[PDB]
Design a protein around this motif. Structure first.
Motif, mmCIF file in Angstrom:
data_model
loop_
_atom_site.group_PDB
_atom_site.id
_atom_site.type_symbol
_atom_site.label_atom_id
_atom_site.label_comp_id
_atom_site.label_asym_id
_atom_site.label_seq_id
_atom_site.Cartn_x
_atom_site.Cartn_y
_atom_site.Cartn_z
ATOM 1 N N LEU B 14 1.128 -0.846 0.025
ATOM 2 C CA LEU B 14 0.321 0.288 0.107
ATOM 3 C C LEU B 14 0.949 0.850 -0.031
ATOM 4 N N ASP B 15 2.136 0.974 0.036
ATOM 5 C CA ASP B 15 3.207 2.131 -0.009
ATOM 6 C C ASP B 15 3.951 2.120 -1.167
ATOM 7 N N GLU B 16 5.071 3.039 -1.830
ATOM 8 C CA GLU B 16 5.441 2.740 -2.964
ATOM 9 C C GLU B 16 5.584 3.335 -4.286
ATOM 10 N N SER B 17 5.497 1.742 -4.809
ATOM 11 C CA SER B 17 4.947 1.653 -6.076
ATOM 12 C C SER B 17 3.329 0.853 -6.658
ATOM 13 N N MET B 18 3.502 -0.030 -5.295
ATOM 14 C CA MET B 18 2.498 -1.323 -5.684
ATOM 15 C C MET B 18 1.533 -0.714 -4.718
ATOM 16 N N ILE B 19 0.090 -0.622 -5.232
ATOM 17 C CA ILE B 19 -1.223 -0.788 -4.830
ATOM 18 C C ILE B 19 -1.817 -1.701 -4.501
ATOM 19 N N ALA B 38 0.827 0.456 -12.667
ATOM 20 C CA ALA B 38 -0.143 0.102 -14.106
ATOM 21 C C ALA B 38 -1.897 0.706 -13.481
ATOM 22 N N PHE B 39 -1.951 0.072 -12.203
ATOM 23 C CA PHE B 39 -3.388 1.069 -12.156
ATOM 24 C C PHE B 39 -3.573 2.516 -12.845
ATOM 25 N N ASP B 40 -2.431 3.246 -13.063
ATOM 26 C CA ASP B 40 -2.125 4.135 -13.808
ATOM 27 C C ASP B 40 -2.675 4.134 -15.323
ATOM 28 N N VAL B 69 -13.060 -0.128 -6.135
ATOM 29 C CA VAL B 69 -12.364 0.526 -5.526
ATOM 30 C C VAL B 69 -12.898 1.959 -5.251
ATOM 31 N N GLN B 70 -11.201 2.802 -5.656
ATOM 32 C CA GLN B 70 -11.527 4.363 -5.506
ATOM 33 C C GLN B 70 -10.131 5.203 -5.091
ATOM 34 N N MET B 71 -10.128 6.201 -5.341
ATOM 35 C CA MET B 71 -8.966 6.900 -5.495
ATOM 36 C C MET B 71 -8.616 7.588 -4.079
ATOM 37 N N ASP B 72 -10.167 7.266 -3.313
ATOM 38 C CA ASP B 72 -10.282 7.311 -2.028
ATOM 39 C C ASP B 72 -9.649 8.371 -1.169
ATOM 40 N N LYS B 73 -8.758 8.117 -0.843
ATOM 41 C CA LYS B 73 -8.087 9.343 0.408
ATOM 42 C C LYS B 73 -7.772 10.714 0.015
ATOM 43 N N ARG B 74 -8.104 11.607 0.965
ATOM 44 C CA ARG B 74 -7.765 13.114 -0.189
ATOM 45 C C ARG B 74 -7.132 13.768 -0.710
ATOM 46 N N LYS B 75 -6.057 13.499 -1.058
ATOM 47 C CA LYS B 75 -4.834 13.601 -1.774
ATOM 48 C C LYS B 75 -5.554 13.382 -3.445
ATOM 49 N N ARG B 76 -6.787 11.995 -3.310
ATOM 50 C CA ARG B 76 -6.907 12.073 -4.473
ATOM 51 C C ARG B 76 -6.313 11.300 -5.166
ATOM 52 N N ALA B 77 -5.895 9.739 -4.831
ATOM 53 C CA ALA B 77 -4.278 9.438 -5.510
ATOM 54 C C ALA B 77 -5.511 7.918 -4.915
ATOM 55 N N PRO B 78 -5.747 6.716 -5.259
ATOM 56 C CA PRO B 78 -6.172 5.645 -5.278
ATOM 57 C C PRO B 78 -5.936 4.662 -4.713
ATOM 58 N N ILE B 79 -5.889 3.833 -3.579
ATOM 59 C CA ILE B 79 -5.478 2.690 -3.150
ATOM 60 C C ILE B 79 -5.924 1.381 -2.002
ATOM 61 N N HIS B 80 -5.797 0.359 -2.600
ATOM 62 C CA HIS B 80 -6.946 -0.599 -1.935
ATOM 63 C C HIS B 80 -7.859 -0.938 -3.186
ATOM 64 N N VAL B 81 -7.796 -1.495 -3.900
ATOM 65 C CA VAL B 81 -8.606 -1.684 -5.185
ATOM 66 C C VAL B 81 -9.457 -2.827 -4.768
#
Lengths: 35, 177, 138, 133
Positions: B14-19, B38-40, B69-81
RNA sequence: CCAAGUCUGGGCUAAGUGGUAAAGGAUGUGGCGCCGCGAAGACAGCCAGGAGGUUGGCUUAGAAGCAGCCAUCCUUUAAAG
């Protein structure tokens, strides 16, 4: 003049750095941008 | 496209480059894999709007991809799909988009416009059988008119996982009619 | 987070007085919008306003939609002086929960409306975040 | 090498013709009396002139013919556009009438072809208020 | 000054920031992704036409890009503006 909040007039008025300072410049007395 | 992982490690992951992103399918799941890179790309294309899949151990090259899924977080960058395939001839839950053009009626003459609380279309045509891009626009726009479910106009696959009369897309006064 | 006396004993059941939600025009994909990150009993008035001035500078197609709205309020000077303070209301809004879906500049290719909202942010108050939505902005 | 916008039936005003020509090496008196020959027929309408001198201090050259804007109005029976284009279009015509009006405008029109002729009448129509339906 | 490595390793500062502050600005600087291309030999320099039906509508007493409210199209050709 505006000391605070300067941002590009004439389609040229340049962005220069004097004393780290940023003071607008461009071929016009109507631009003497400075902060 | 590719995306790996599935052990038991979300934090660093959930950190770095792999979501995170579960391997969801009717009957079975398997630790979250994928990647925050990838998600990207792909996602960037049109998540649950077209479909593909990735080769993890050639395992099972199948489609269905994301159903959540969701880019949830505030920032607007998904995590946990969420990820679910479908190698079946049951494909329902099919939500693919629908586009107009600009047909001139209320706009390029009345300036008027039109809301489209619709856009999408969760239906269920011929499983593993849908035109990634379906267009339908009989035109019309201006004054106090409106169009929605009911009328519509469905081609081939006769589903409608939806109902009649409801958020289609009307024409309102971008200023006044 | 001091809040009010109740939804019908002190001051609860209003219209809050403002200028409704939607503007601009549709748009299926193009995701053009605005949100924040700041926490603040969003200054009603200031609010209402702001957004509006937004339309003032544009006019038509650009989801001038906006997902905000206050609904509670403060109070202060009224009566004796400073001690046992009763309460005189004034100024409702709503908590801008440390960022979130603000208003939307949503439409195909119409940045002529992006700049707008832009003008919309400029305004506002608590800084604001300039952004795009699923896809970006076309 | 000058360009003016002189009137009709009046070839003696000092205020405009005087300074605008005399300093350029142009005899005001003689250049004026020559206009009383060709502007006498269509007197009343302002006609632009394009005088071109040489190295002898004379000549008159191409003045005109007249208007080409008011005769088109006489046929249609509109003085002016309705309001603002692409917002109040209400003046539709037909296909066959736009086809024959472009066949005579060819001299100052883009190319001598038939496909390029109908395309200019499409641009100057929607910029005013004449939609083709 | 006052006891204890002007230790070693690899980055970042060029303002004394450190040695109090916000909204707000700006090819500062250093490290990461995008669109177009350099032998349709690319941006800034330089040669030239600096194209024609464009000189359309409110207001015209003047829109005729270079008052402003609406257009935003066609072209014969080296392309369009």
């Amino acid at each position: 003049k505006v000391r605070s909040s300067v941002k590009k007039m004439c389609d040229n008025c340049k962005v220069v750095r004097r004393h780290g300072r940023v003071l607008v410049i461009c071929s016009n007395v109507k631009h003497k941008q400075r902060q | 496209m590719e995306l790996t992982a599935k052990p038991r490690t979300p934090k660093q992951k959930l950190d770095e480059s792999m979501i995170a992103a579960v391997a969801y399918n009717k009957e079975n799941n398997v630790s979250f894999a994928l990647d925050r890179k990838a998600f990207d790309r792909a996602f960037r294309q049109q998540s649950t709007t077209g479909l593909f899949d990735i080769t993890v151990e050639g395992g099972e090259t199948f489609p269905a991809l994301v159903k959540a899924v969701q880019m949830d977080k505030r920032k607007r960058a998904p995590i946990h799909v969420d990820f679910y395939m479908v190698t079946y001839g049951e494909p329902v839950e099919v939500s693919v988009p629908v586009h107009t053009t600009g047909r001139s009626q209320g706009e390029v003459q009345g300036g008027l416009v039109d809301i489209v609380v619709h856009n999408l279309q969760i239906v269920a045509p011929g499983p593993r059988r849908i035109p990634q891009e379906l267009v339908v626009d009989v035109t019309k726009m201006n004054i106090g008119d409106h169009i929605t479910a009911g009328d519509i106009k469905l081609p081939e696959g006769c589903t409608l996982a939806a109902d009649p009369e409801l958020t289609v897309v009307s024409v309102l006064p971008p200023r006044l009619t | 987070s001091i809040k009010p006396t109740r939804r019908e004993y002190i001051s609860g059941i209003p219209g809050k007085g403002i200028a409704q939600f939607k503007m601009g025009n549709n748009t299926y994909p193009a995701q053009v919008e605005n949100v924040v990150e700041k926490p603040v009993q969003i200054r009603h008035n200031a609010l209402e306003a702001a957004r509006n001035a937004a339309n003032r500078f544009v006019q038509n197609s650009g989801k001038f939609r906006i997902r905000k709205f206050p609904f509670h309020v403060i109070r202060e000077q009224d009566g004796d002086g400073m001690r046992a303070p009763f309460g005189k209301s004034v100024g409702t809004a709503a908590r801008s929960h440390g960022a979130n879906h603000d208003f939307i500049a949503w439409v195909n290719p119409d940045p002529a409306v992006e700049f707008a909202w832009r003008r919309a942010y400029m305004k506002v108050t608590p800084t604001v975040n300039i952004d795009s939505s699923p896809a970006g902005n076309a | 090498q000058i360009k003016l916008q002189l009137p009709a039936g009046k070839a003696t005003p000092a205020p405009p013709v005087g300074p605008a020509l005399g300093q350029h090496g142009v005899n005001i008196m003689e250049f004026c009396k020559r206009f009383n020959a060709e502007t006498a027929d269509k007197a009343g309408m302002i006609l632009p002139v394009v005088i071109t001198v040489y190295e002898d201090k004379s000549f008159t050259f191409i003045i005109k013919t007249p208007p080409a804007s008011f005769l088109l109005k006489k046929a249609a029976g509109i003085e002016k556009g309705s309001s603002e284009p692409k917002r109040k279009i209400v003046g539709k015509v037909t296909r066959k009438q736009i086809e024959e009006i472009a066949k005579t405008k060819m001299p100052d029109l883009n190319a001598n072809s038939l496909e390029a002729a109908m395309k200019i009448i499409e641009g100057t129509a929607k910029s005013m208020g004449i939609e083709v339906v």
